[PDB]
Amino acid sequence: ATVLLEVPFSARGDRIPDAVAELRTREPIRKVRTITGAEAWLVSSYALCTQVLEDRRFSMKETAAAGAPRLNALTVPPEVVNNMGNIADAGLRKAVMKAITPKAPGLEQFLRDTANSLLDNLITEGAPADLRNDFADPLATALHCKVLGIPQEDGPKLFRSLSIAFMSSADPIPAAKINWDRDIEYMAGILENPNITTGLMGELSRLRKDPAYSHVSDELFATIGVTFFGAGVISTGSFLTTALISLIQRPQLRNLLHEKPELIPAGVEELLRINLSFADGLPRLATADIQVGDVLVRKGELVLVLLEGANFDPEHFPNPGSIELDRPNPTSHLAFGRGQHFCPGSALGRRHAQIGIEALLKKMPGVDLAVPIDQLVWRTRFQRRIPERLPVLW
Ligand code: HEM
Numbered sequence: 431a432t433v434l435l436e437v438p439f440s441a442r443g444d445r446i447p448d449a450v451a452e453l454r455t456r457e458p459i460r461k462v463r464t465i466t467g468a469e470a471w472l473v474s475s476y477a478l479c480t481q482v483l484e485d486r487r488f489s490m491k492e493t494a495a496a497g498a499p500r501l502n503a504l505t506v507p508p509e510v511v512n513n514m515g516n517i518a519d520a521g522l523r524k525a526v527m528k529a530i531t532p533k534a535p536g537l538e539q540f541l542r543d544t545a546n547s548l549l550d551n552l553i554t555e556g557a558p559a560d561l562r563n564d565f566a567d568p569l570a571t572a573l574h575c576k577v578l579g580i581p582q583e584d585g586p587k588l589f590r591s592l593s594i595a596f597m598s599s600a601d602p603i604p605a606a607k608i609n610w611d612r613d614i615e616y617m618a619g620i621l622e623n624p625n626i627t628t629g630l631m632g633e634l635s636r637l638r639k640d641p642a643y644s645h646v647s648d649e650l651f652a653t654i655g656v657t658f659f660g661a662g663v664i665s666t667g668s669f670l671t672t673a674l675i676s677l678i679q680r681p682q683l684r685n686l687l688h689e690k691p692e693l694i695p696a697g698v699e700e701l702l703r704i705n706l707s708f709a710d711g712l713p714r715l716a717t718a719d720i721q722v723g724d725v726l727v728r729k730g731e732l733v734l735v736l737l738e739g740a741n742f743d744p745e746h747f748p749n750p751g752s753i754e755l756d757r758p759n760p761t762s763h764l765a766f767g768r769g770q771h772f773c774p775g776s777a778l779g780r781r782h783a784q785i786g787i788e789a790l791l792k793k794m795p796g797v798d799l800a801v802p803i804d805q806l807v808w809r810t811r812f813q814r815r816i817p818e819r820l821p822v823l824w
């Protein structure tokens with residue numbers, strides 16, 4: 431006798447498990463057990479993943495309902511699971527989007543200057559260098575302080591909440607509440623700080639005093655700052671880190687992008703497609719009985735949309751494990767999701783990775799791992815797959 435298949439399969443972000451293609455072929459929707467002990471439906475084909483993400487009856491908000499089967503414990507208040515819905519209901523979606531575009535004057539130059547400064551410091555210090563802790567994550571942090579309009583010196587402490595805030599735990603996490611409440615207090619102070627007049631927080635600060643937003647809660651305004659900092663920093667830092675591994679393990683591609691940097695955007699789109707940064711499927715709770723492939727999902731059941739299931743599906747992306755810069759459907763991957771909850775920071779995430787990679791290839795054309803790849807230490811029970819350190823030489 432064996433127990434029901436458990437998720438996630440592996441915390442490693444450098445290889446996709448063979449089990450993914452086996453499930454996709456044999457049972458592209460099948461029952462699994464999550465870390466909390468709940469059962470869920472794991473969806474692993476492109477066709478079924480998109481079906482779920484495109485049907486709002488598979489609800490993100492309802493995953494926070496008391497008594498629901500859970501993928502993991504909440505690390506935020508339950509209402510914050512509906513964060514984007516709350517922002518939209520407050521009439522703030524357009525303003526938040528506009529504030530997080532990479533097209534803001536001087537923003538791309540700031541990303542370039544910051545990436546170049548971080549790389550120059552690594553070169554001065556000498557190999558080995560840690561590309562996660564001393565490149566990708568500080569670049570993500572600096573970017574988000576700039577986008578938010580908050581002091582660069584405040585970034586490191588906000589960043590240190592993230593190793594806990596983005597845990598994927600079976601049980602509630604006491605430290606997550608301590609950090610959440612403290613970070614909310616910080617953002618509430620930013621809204622009242624007369625010096626904060628730029629970026630997302632400067633815009634929220636002004637809208638907060640505009641009569642057309644007088645009944646939007648101060649709780650929501652502070653929550654937008656904490657959540658966009660956290661989601662953006664963890665997602666960009668983690669994606670860039672693991673994309674650097676994907677690139678370092680593909681020296682022919684690395685050489686091609688070094689030689690022809692105009693191919694970097696197409697390269698980043700493929701690095702997004704093959705990315706294993708999301709450690710768990712995207713969760714949704716069924717609000718009705720809905721047929722998904724051979725399974726009638728019942729109201730109240732949990733569904734997990736496995737992004738690498740979709741993104742490595744050979745029926746949608748032939749030769750899925752290969753980075754091919756001339757695919758006919760290059761942006762049709764699910765790295766930023768699909769449907770109602772499509773990533774609001776997608777353009778900024780793409781630009782962060784493009785500039786980070788462009789700068790690294792110019793500064794360190796000979797970049798390579800400084801340890802055998804198996805020696806990377808993959809963070810466990812986390813919402814992202816990331817190596818704890820990424821030691822390189824050049
Ligand atoms: C490479 C970088 C990024 C990746 C791969 C990524 C990926 C994703 C994915 C897959 C989703 C959909 C989740 C779902 O449907 O359950 C999402 C949602 C979200 N992301 Fe991103 N993200 C990235 C960057 C960012 C940035 C830069 C920000 C903000 C500054 C951001 C903010 C958010 C937020 C707030 C949501 C929730 C949207 C909703 O619920 O409607 N992301 N992201």
Ligand SMILES: O=C1N[C@@H](Cc2ccc(O)cc2)CN[C@H]1Cc1ccc(O)cc1
Nearest residue numbers: 506510511513514595656657660661713
């Ligand atoms: O915008 C959001 N949208 C939802 C997206 C979501 C839903 C369910 C999950 O299992 C994971 C993420 C959750 N809260 C935020 C993301 C977030 C989470 C934790 C933090 O400490 C900071 C920012």
